[PDB]
């Protein structure tokens, strides 16, 4: 809302490295348990 | 409420959560009785 607005001019492809994969992920350390809920 | 047998047409009150069978006929197809609130038509 406070931010402006803008167009798109170019789409660049490419494979992403594990570096940014670990850096921008949301669940730090990683998902470990195969069971989703417990109680 | 009140139900009508499908063969002998003898009304019999069936209570909630009760098997569906007639009496004096032993039949298993019941028709609900027509309502008693009145609706009006037009001849048009």
């Amino acid at each position: 809302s406070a931010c402006p607005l803008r167009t798109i001019k170019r789409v660049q492809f490419g494979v992403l490295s594990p570096d940014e994969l670990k850096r921008m992920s949301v669940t730090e350390g990683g998902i470990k348990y195969p069971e989703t809920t417990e109680g | 409420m009140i139900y009508i047998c499908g063969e002998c047409h003898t009304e019999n009150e069936i209570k909630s959560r009760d098997p569906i069978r007639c009496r004096e006929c032993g039949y298993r197809i019941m028709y609900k009785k027509r309502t008693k609130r009145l609706v009006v038509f037009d001849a048009r």
């Binding site: 803008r6 798109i8 | 499908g6 909630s16 298993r28 019941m30 028709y31 609900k32 309502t35």
Partner: protein, 477 residues
Amino acid sequence: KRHIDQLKEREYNNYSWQDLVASGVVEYIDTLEEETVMLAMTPDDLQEKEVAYCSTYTHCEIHPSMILGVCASIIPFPDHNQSPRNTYQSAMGKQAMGVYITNFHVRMDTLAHVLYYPQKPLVTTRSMEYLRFRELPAGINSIVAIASYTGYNQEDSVIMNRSAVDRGFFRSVFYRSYKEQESKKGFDQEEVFEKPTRETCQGMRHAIYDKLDDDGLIAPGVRVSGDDVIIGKTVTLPTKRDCSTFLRTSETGIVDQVMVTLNQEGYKFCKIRVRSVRIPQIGDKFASRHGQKGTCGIQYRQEDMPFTCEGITPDIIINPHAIPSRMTIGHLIECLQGKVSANKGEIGDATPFNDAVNVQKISNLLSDYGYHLRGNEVLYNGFTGRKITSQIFIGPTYYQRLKHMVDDKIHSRARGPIQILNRQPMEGRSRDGGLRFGEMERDCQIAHGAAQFLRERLFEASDPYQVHVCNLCGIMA
């Protein structure tokens, strides 16, 4: 002849088809065997000694009219129409409303149509006594005029008399059934018919639950309109979370009868039939017996239709341009033959290869019936009372009412319910979703040069959305 005068007595003689085969006068002939045979079409004409085609005939046909199916042997004089026309009607008399079975009171079918006043034809083929078309007919003999009146019957349409519709013309009814079955899908998840109360049950909407009785079903006789609840079925929550069944939109029916019994696996279930009357209006589809379908354009009262010199207004008016391009001349003889049958009191005969009646013979009879032999008559204009310079061809014909009515094909959407995963417009309870904007429509707009309308239809009128994007990188934020 000895075989005929004892075959017209099967009722109290016990002599029938089987005693006819076993005497060696008829014989079944396969297709392969039919290549080593020489057939004659008709006895009195092909088996006379002369300078003759052949002289070694081996078999003879019974009547050459038995080469037609079931739906194609109800057409009068089809040996006078163009060929593709006979194909259309045979695929069109399969969807004409009538009475379909005598015990239609017991059967709780879905989608049953029934006509009020069916009538049998005035011009019949002789092979209709064997398929019971005079005991369960589908149609009404109407008085048709072929003229251009006010322009509302152009391009395959018909004008029809409004004050004949008010006397029962082509009126019908319409039934429909609904099923519901109570079920125990789980040990605790169990359904039951009961009247859902507002404070106990929760997943209700805003319906009026007063029409339901204590059982949860509507008694027959009430007038159920669109968006009413008819069956109240509550599910117990691991309190009570209610479901129910609502009508479709725009029914305006009347509950006919309610049945309660046990289906195969023994679960209690009920069936409900809804009755609704359908009066002909200006979208409905009407068709003749010769492949002329057409909607209804407008309805005039009796004080406006054109009349004859004794007050006979037509029930239907059709365009003369429908005839010359498709060449259905069988349509122009059954309305000439029909006018003789109403004046004499017989019922006509239109067996195809009998071809007994010459049109002129029939035509002459009409002048004899004081109704000009040309099938032509002098009509007066209904608005101003003046005579019409031309003479109009008028007579009785047999029309049918097809199944496609207009109450069933109208729908509209304006900001309706959408989906959940893709947020695209979805159908709702009012039967009415959106119309697809296909690929070929995306190109007419490009050739037009309309760039705003092309954007609105695809983005603003379908799943608009906003996201945030980073500046240095091009990833969402």
